[PDB]
Amino acid sequence: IKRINKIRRRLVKDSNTKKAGKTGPMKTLLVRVMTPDLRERLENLRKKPENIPQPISNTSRANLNKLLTDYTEMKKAILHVYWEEFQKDPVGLMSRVAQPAPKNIDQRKLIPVKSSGFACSQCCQPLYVYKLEQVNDKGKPHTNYFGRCNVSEHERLILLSPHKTYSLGKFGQRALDFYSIHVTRESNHPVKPLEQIGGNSCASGPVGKALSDACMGAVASFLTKYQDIILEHQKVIKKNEKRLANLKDIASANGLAFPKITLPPQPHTKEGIEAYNNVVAQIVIWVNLNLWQKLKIGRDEAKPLQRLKGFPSFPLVERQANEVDWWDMVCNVKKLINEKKEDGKVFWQNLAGYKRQEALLPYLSSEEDRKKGKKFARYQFGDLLLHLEKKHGEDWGKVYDEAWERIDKKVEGLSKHIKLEEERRSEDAQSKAALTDWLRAKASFVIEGLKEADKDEFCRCELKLQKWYGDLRGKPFAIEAENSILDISGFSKQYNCAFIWQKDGVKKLNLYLIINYFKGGKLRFKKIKPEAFEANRFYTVINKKSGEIVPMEVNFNFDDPNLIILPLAFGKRQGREFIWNDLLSLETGSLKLANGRVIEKTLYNRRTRQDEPALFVALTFERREVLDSSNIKPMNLIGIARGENIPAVIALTDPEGCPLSRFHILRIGESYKEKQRTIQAAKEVEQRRAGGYSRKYASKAKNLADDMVRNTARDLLYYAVTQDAMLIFANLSRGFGRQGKRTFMAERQYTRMEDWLTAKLAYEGLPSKTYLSKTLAQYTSKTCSNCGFTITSADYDRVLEKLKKTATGWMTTINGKELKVEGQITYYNRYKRQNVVKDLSVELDRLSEESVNNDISSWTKGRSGEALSLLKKRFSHRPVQEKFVCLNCGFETHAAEQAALNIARSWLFLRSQEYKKYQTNKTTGNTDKRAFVETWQSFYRKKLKEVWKPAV
DNA sequence: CGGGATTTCATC
RNA sequence: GGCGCGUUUAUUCCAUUACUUUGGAGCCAGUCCCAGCGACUAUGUCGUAUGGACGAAGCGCUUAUUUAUCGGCCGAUAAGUAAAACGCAUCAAAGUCCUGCAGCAGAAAAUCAAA
DNA sequence: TTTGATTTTCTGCTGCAGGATGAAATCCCG
């Protein structure tokens, strides 16, 4: 059958196994700790078993909770202190936390800097730079840089990176010796969480050696982010200089007096970031007000200034908690609107004749916003004002009052609903967002009364209300639940934690987990002989740096008021993988338990119908013996064709490009798109009935898509294994994916399918390249198999130029092929939001009615571009995302199967001596892709003539 | 003078 | 989608240890009860079960409490209450986790000194 | 998105960093 575990069994039997290197492929077993509610669930089976194991003792729970609280508080205190230090001195901190090179390089330094880049915070002295040229694995010389000082105490190996003027390049979690500062009593630093928070009731060693990493990792990450952003800030400022200069030139071309507001330079505080971003936003608003719409100048003509993004915030401390409070900001908005209500009332009541229509231009929605079931608050506010104007005439004095009454009623109702929801147990972010939109529209309309009288006051009010609107939209999802972690830096005797089993019979084992992190607790680890096992006793093993295993015996008391005892709860497959695996067992050392965690996160309990915290044990198992890249030989190929109606059509072929029948065409996940469409229809119905859907449809589409992806991946892997085959994908940059107007991150699955197969082959120890491959996606999906011709836009330009009218009508040719200029093309106009069908010949006649003799090249370049767009939309080789049409010969068959075969044939093409000759020609400085296109077309035609006979 | 830690130092 | 239920997800031995999910299948989706949308015939009604709250989600086999058709209390046939040997719809899959920041995937409003 | 012209709009939750541990010298203890 098709089981992933049978595939893994064959893979294990397919080749020899060898022990893992310095670090093995990490894998986490996430089990759940036996709890009283777990036992309650277990007791209610129809076929009740003989023995129900005991739950976890209450003392263990209390001790674990106290330990988690202490660890969290210690981490918070340490990060707070180091945030204060950073807020005092950035340079010294980021110089200290720089990760030194390993204290093992005894290579002789040869070339110092031909100097004053940074300074060691210990001596505040400049760090000399030294280079070192060596020979790498593949023959490319590499240049490294290191920092050493005149002080023997400061003779470290701080990393330096070149630029074209130097940077650190590394930030570690163990560079700064955290132990000697806040734990040991000899140091007199005023911060000592162990002596202060825990009251000398917690063990020093393990807790400190965990806190060190648990804080310095985050510190190093933030320092890396900031030290990387510091250079891009300067470069972005430099680019903005030229962009502003060009914009000023364009503005002065029309004789426009540019406002005297200048760009703040690259700052190093977030206040400067905010000021520069506000200046940029105001400049963009002014340009949109005066140039984009007034002059009908498009966006290509205006390269704008850039806002500042990418400046990080300090971990766990600069995470804003929104202390300004939601209701306080709402009341501030109310007060500001009430103060500025008179200004808007006077402006609208005392409006001129024709100025009334232009005053309401932003308030009225166009077809684009109206057709999509719902409009922004500004649009509906304008429509309500239009209704009031229709109902009560031009009496805007009372119209404003009635509109204020309606908006105030809606605001009060929304506020009451929000308070009622948020008081007891619930929260309504949708209502908050709607109320915020209403308040924003009301504030805009109210303060629009000062658009031409008091410019600065109006702008200040606008900025304040906009930032208040942003804060009111952002604050509600601040969350209240955070994970709690309890690290175990390693599994050795010192750390006083171990995994134990009961030697029942020959192989059966009971499972207990013991935590010893308190002073006064008793836990004895006794070394024993290899086969001294006895019943009612716990036994375990230990790992060693030299590859030795030294099993030991555990003895303790179940009523100890200090230690923590954990019974587990898991399933057969998990036990066969980690706990009681048959082939790779922890006794031999093939499977190793390196580190674990006591993660406590909220999970849904169906018995209580609620989400409650549930202790997990993220036992990270490092597979110490993996497969060897010694017996693997791809051969057969499985060309995967992507699409929507058919999730995947796969074509089999040999390593001669000759397809063979062993199943030849297989389709997996049929009608699943119909289920996706049904789910989408239900969601759209729920939106039409309220504007949103519930949590039942939260991930139905996502879950179905992921299930389809994983099932298809399993099927592909089984086919590859059973046929000794390989899979063909494309070479796409990281982050590849389509983003239209309604795209979701879950459709970036081609790369994610590659990644899933990569991870699955990676836990077994082999890279993705063994059975997963990529094709150079240059013109791969743009080729047909009947003519060997790949369409380019130069041919489109030639077709546009050649377009003329003969006795039978318009005529144009591609590669000498006469094309009947006839037929109708359908387009989806966003202004109409419907289907409009136009005739190519009729539109050409209409466009040429302004010219003589139908010479398109004699028209304006805009008319030629429009004719080019018409010809391209008529002669597009990809009319639909799921349809391909051959422009040259139009051989007729099932398109998807032919495309599936052609994908594999293209991947085969992406290795040839023709490509070698193309590379040699490209070494002549002719960096043109047209040579590649010609070579690929010629090679494909030659191969079609020789062995790749098209369908007969 | 070993139990028995106990911490402290240290380190890809 | 709401409720339940277990199956298989290991080649001779490694829990029929249950966890975290998705499917197949079995049953059930009504109550403006409160609040978002159109007409707004105006802050009034209707509808679109939308967001939450509210019930909602098998059958028989084996063992005792609810009766006499029979002779001067014996079982004749069956209810549900319980246990549980239990049989059917009911049969299939996969898992590698943490901390921090917030950010990365676009295109249609879009033409000029339009190279 | 895939040949030359481009950039403020409305959508939605993942994309980049940091990783997954034994000697040494002491101490409480006489």
Residue with smallest Cα–C1' gap to C84: A47
* Sequence-separated (6 or more) residues with CB below 8 Å from residue A611: A602, A603, A604, A605
Residues A437 and A517 occupy one common structural domain = no
**Helical (H) or strand (E) element with A538:** strand A538-540
Residues A618 and A517 occupy one common structural domain = yes
**Cβ contact A129:A160 at 8 Å:** yes
Q: What is the CA radius of gyration of chain A?
A: 35
> How many C-beta atoms lie closer than 10 Å to residue A625's C-beta?
18
Taking the CA of residue A372 and the C1' sugar atom of nucleotide C59, their distance in angstroms comes to 51
Minimum CA–C1' distance nucleotide for A929: D3
Residue with smallest Cα–C1' gap to C108: A830
> How many C-beta atoms lie closer than 10 Å to residue A775's C-beta?
19
> How many C-beta atoms lie closer than 10 Å to residue A276's C-beta?
22
* Sequence-separated (6 or more) residues with CB below 8 Å from residue A214: A71, A75, A485, A487
**A414 domain residue, yes or no:** yes
Taking the CA of residue A295 and the C1' sugar atom of nucleotide C112, their distance in angstroms comes to 10
Minimum CA–C1' distance nucleotide for A185: B7
Exposure string over A337-362, b if 16+ CB within 10 A, otherwise e: beebbebbbebbeebeeeeeeebbee
Residue reference for tokens 């004053």? A116
Minimum CA–C1' distance nucleotide for A546: D22
Q: For strand C, is any atom closer than 7 Å to the CB of A580? A: yes
DSSP for A798-813 reads HHHHH-EEETTEEEEE
How many whole angstroms separate alpha carbon A284 and alpha carbon A304? Answer: 7
The total number of structural domains that make up chain A: 5
Amino acid at A22: K
DSSP state of A857: G
Q: For strand C, is any atom closer than 7 Å to the CB of A362? A: no
* Tokens encoding A361: 């231009």
Query: Which of A461, A464, A482, A483 shows the shortest CA–CA distance to A472?
Result: A464
How many whole angstroms separate alpha carbon A874 and alpha carbon A857? Answer: 20
**A578 domain residue, yes or no:** yes
Length of chain A: 952
* Sequence-separated (6 or more) residues with CB below 8 Å from residue A538: A500, A501, A502, A512, A553, A554, A555
**Cβ contact A437:A429 at 8 Å:** no
Query: Which of A509, A491, A501 shows the shortest CA–CA distance to A538?
Result: A501
**Cβ contact A339:A312 at 8 Å:** no
Residues A26 and A165 occupy one common structural domain = no
Q: For strand C, is any atom closer than 7 Å to the CB of A827? A: no
Minimum CA–C1' distance nucleotide for A735: C105
Residues A388 and A504 occupy one common structural domain = no
Minimum CA–C1' distance nucleotide for A221: D17
How many whole angstroms separate alpha carbon A576 and alpha carbon A469? Answer: 55
Task: Show the domain range for A767.
Answer: 636-775
* Sequence-separated (6 or more) residues with CB below 8 Å from residue A527: A550, A551, A552, A553
Query: Which of A279, A281, A278, A283 shows the shortest CA–CA distance to A248?
Result: A283
DSSP helix/strand/coil, A402 = helix
Taking the CA of residue A555 and the C1' sugar atom of nucleotide C21, their distance in angstroms comes to 38
Query: Which of A209, A38, A52, A49 shows the shortest CA–CA distance to A616?
Result: A38
How many whole angstroms separate alpha carbon A563 and alpha carbon A556? Answer: 9
* Sequence-separated (6 or more) residues with CB below 8 Å from residue A665: A649, A650, A651, A897, A900
**A269 domain residue, yes or no:** no
Taking the CA of residue A5 and the C1' sugar atom of nucleotide C22, their distance in angstroms comes to 18
Residue with smallest Cα–C1' gap to D19: A217
DSSP helix/strand/coil, A29 = strand
> How many C-beta atoms lie closer than 10 Å to residue A116's C-beta?
10
The last residue of one of the domains, among A230, A253, A282, is A230
How many whole angstroms separate alpha carbon A377 and alpha carbon A390? Answer: 20
Taking the CA of residue A576 and the C1' sugar atom of nucleotide C59, their distance in angstroms comes to 37
DSSP for A708-749 reads HHHHHHHHHHHHHHHHTEEEEEE---TT----SSS--GGG--
Minimum CA–C1' distance nucleotide for A779: D2
Minimum CA–C1' distance nucleotide for A318: C101
> How many C-beta atoms lie closer than 10 Å to residue A186's C-beta?
5
Residue with smallest Cα–C1' gap to C85: A47
Beta-strand relationship, A552-555 and A111-112: unpaired
**Cβ contact A918:A931 at 8 Å:** yes
Report in angstroms the alpha-carbon separations of A782 from A228, A785, A928.
40, 10, 18
**Cβ contact A665:A651 at 8 Å:** yes
Minimum CA–C1' distance nucleotide for A210: D21
Residues A339 and A377 occupy one common structural domain = yes
> Can you say how many angstroms the Cα of residue A362 is from the centroid of all Cα atoms in its chain?
35
The last residue of one of the domains, among A230, A251, A286, is A230
* Tokens encoding A660: 């063979």
DSSP for A141-209 reads EEEEEEEE-S-STT---EEEEE---EE---B-SSSS--HHHHTSSSS--S--HHHHTSTT-B-SHHHHH
Burial class for A797, CB neighbours closer than 10 Å (0-12, 13-18, 19+): middle
Q: Is A890 left (phi over 0), alpha (psi -120 to 50) or beta?
A: left
Task: Provide the edge-to-edge strand list for the sheet that holds A809-814.
Answer: A804-806, A809-814, A817-820
Query: Which of A902, A56, A64, A51 shows the shortest CA–CA distance to A515?
Result: A64
Q: What proportions of chain A, in percent to the nearest 5, are helix, strand and coil?
A: 45, 15, 40
How many whole angstroms separate alpha carbon A484 and alpha carbon A610? Answer: 19
Q: For strand C, is any atom closer than 7 Å to the CB of A527? A: no
Beta-strand relationship, A600-605 and A772-775: unpaired
Minimum CA–C1' distance nucleotide for A179: B8
Residues A419 and A494 occupy one common structural domain = no
Phi, psi of A488, rounded to the nearest 5 degrees:
-130, 95
Q: For strand C, is any atom closer than 7 Å to the CB of A594? A: no
DSSP helix/strand/coil, A916 = helix
**A214 domain residue, yes or no:** yes
| CB half-sphere exposure, A113, CA atoms < 13 A | 17
Residues A377 and A447 occupy one common structural domain = yes
Residues A538 and A610 occupy one common structural domain = yes
Query: Which of A275, A332, A344, A326 shows the shortest CA–CA distance to A465?
Result: A332
Query: Which of A550, A575, A568, A552 shows the shortest CA–CA distance to A514?
Result: A568
Amino acid at A99: Q
Residue with smallest Cα–C1' gap to C102: A312
Residue with smallest Cα–C1' gap to B6: A205
**Cβ contact A806:A761 at 8 Å:** no
**A11 domain residue, yes or no:** no
How many whole angstroms separate alpha carbon A649 and alpha carbon A671? Answer: 14
Q: For strand C, is any atom closer than 7 Å to the CB of A511? A: yes
How many whole angstroms separate alpha carbon A474 and alpha carbon A322? Answer: 9
Q: Which nucleotides of B are covered by protein (CB under 7 A)?
A: 4-12
Exposure string over A873-894, b if 16+ CB within 10 A, otherwise e: ebbbbeeeeeebebbbeeeeee
Taking the CA of residue A456 and the C1' sugar atom of nucleotide D30, their distance in angstroms comes to 84
* Tokens encoding A808: 């039978």
Minimum CA–C1' distance nucleotide for A302: D7
How many whole angstroms separate alpha carbon A106 and alpha carbon A90? Answer: 32
Minimum CA–C1' distance nucleotide for A194: B7
Q: For strand C, is any atom closer than 7 Å to the CB of A376? A: no
Taking the CA of residue A529 and the C1' sugar atom of nucleotide B9, their distance in angstroms comes to 33
Report in angstroms the alpha-carbon separations of A475 from A44, A316, A480.
44, 17, 12
> Across A830-951, where does the E strand assignment appear?
834-839
Q: For strand C, is any atom closer than 7 Å to the CB of A409? A: yes
Minimum CA–C1' distance nucleotide for A181: B8
The last residue of one of the domains, among A627, A661, A680, is A627
**Helical (H) or strand (E) element with A894:** none
Taking the CA of residue A115 and the C1' sugar atom of nucleotide C74, their distance in angstroms comes to 116
Taking the CA of residue A798 and the C1' sugar atom of nucleotide D8, their distance in angstroms comes to 34
How many whole angstroms separate alpha carbon A158 and alpha carbon A154? Answer: 10
How many whole angstroms separate alpha carbon A278 and alpha carbon A878? Answer: 44
* Sequence-separated (6 or more) residues with CB below 8 Å from residue A470: none
Minimum CA–C1' distance nucleotide for A521: B5
Q: For strand C, is any atom closer than 7 Å to the CB of A672? A: no
Minimum CA–C1' distance nucleotide for A174: B11
Residue with smallest Cα–C1' gap to D21: A490
List of A residues 387-406 with CB within 7 A of strand C: 387, 391, 402, 405-406
Minimum CA–C1' distance nucleotide for A742: D11
Residue reference for tokens 């546009």? A800
**Cβ contact A879:A895 at 8 Å:** no
**A884 domain residue, yes or no:** yes
Residues A640 and A687 occupy one common structural domain = yes
**Cβ contact A500:A491 at 8 Å:** no
How many whole angstroms separate alpha carbon A466 and alpha carbon A473? Answer: 10
Taking the CA of residue A692 and the C1' sugar atom of nucleotide C31, their distance in angstroms comes to 21
**Cβ contact A172:A220 at 8 Å:** yes
**A277 domain residue, yes or no:** no
Residues A77 and A159 occupy one common structural domain = yes
How many whole angstroms separate alpha carbon A559 and alpha carbon A57? Answer: 9
Experimental method: cryo-EM
Q: For strand C, is any atom closer than 7 Å to the CB of A412? A: no
Residues A203 and A114 occupy one common structural domain = yes
Report in angstroms the alpha-carbon separations of A511 from A33, A64, A299, A580, A723.
11, 18, 66, 11, 41
Taking the CA of residue A209 and the C1' sugar atom of nucleotide B4, their distance in angstroms comes to 21
How many whole angstroms separate alpha carbon A451 and alpha carbon A456? Answer: 9
Taking the CA of residue A828 and the C1' sugar atom of nucleotide C77, their distance in angstroms comes to 76
How many whole angstroms separate alpha carbon A24 and alpha carbon A591? Answer: 10
List of A residues 863-892 with CB within 7 A of strand C: 865
Minimum CA–C1' distance nucleotide for A303: D7
**Cβ contact A63:A562 at 8 Å:** yes
Residue reference for tokens 């003509």? A301
Q: Bridge partners of A202?
A: A518
**Cβ contact A309:A229 at 8 Å:** no
**Cβ contact A32:A570 at 8 Å:** yes
Phi, psi of A404, rounded to the nearest 5 degrees:
-60, -40
**A278 domain residue, yes or no:** no
Specify the resolution in Å: 3.4
Minimum CA–C1' distance nucleotide for A428: C51
DSSP for A53-104 reads -----HHHHHHHHHHHHHHHHHHHHHHHHHHHHHHH-HHHHHHHSBPBPPTT
**Cβ contact A14:A632 at 8 Å:** yes
Residue with smallest Cα–C1' gap to C8: A3
Residue with smallest Cα–C1' gap to D22: A545
How many whole angstroms separate alpha carbon A396 and alpha carbon A680? Answer: 44
Where do the H-state alpha helices sit in A448-594?
A: 455-474, 572-574
DSSP helix/strand/coil, A824 = strand
Residues A727 and A846 occupy one common structural domain = no
How many whole angstroms separate alpha carbon A918 and alpha carbon A936? Answer: 9
- What string of H, E and C letters represents the secondary structure of A663-719? CCEEECCCCHHHHHHHHHHHHHHHHHHHCCCCCCCCCHHHHHHHHHHHHHHHHHHHH
* Sequence-separated (6 or more) residues with CB below 8 Å from residue A271: none
Q: Strand B: list protein residues with Cβ under 7 Å.
A: A 102-104, 172, 174, 177, 179-180, 183-186, 203-205, 208-209, 212, 494, 519, 524
